[PDB]
Amino acid sequence: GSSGSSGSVGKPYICQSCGKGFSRPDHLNGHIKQVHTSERPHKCQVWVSGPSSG
Ligand SMILES: [Zn+2]
What we know:
The protein has 54 residues and is of the alpha+beta class. The protein is built from 1 helix and 2 strands. A two-stranded antiparallel ribbon has the order 1-2. The structure holds zinc ion. Zinc ion binds next to α1. This is POZ-, AT hook-, and zinc finger-containing protein 1.
């Protein structure tokens, strides 16, 4: 029951976001920065802000 365990013969650079595929590094990048591009929240400019953590 494998029916898998294979890739694509041509475009090795496969997007690690959706699964797309490209031939060049820059080409794929644009897609990840043109389609996947988005904004995400970050820490308060520090590892721990509260009383303690770890
Ligand atoms: Zn993608």
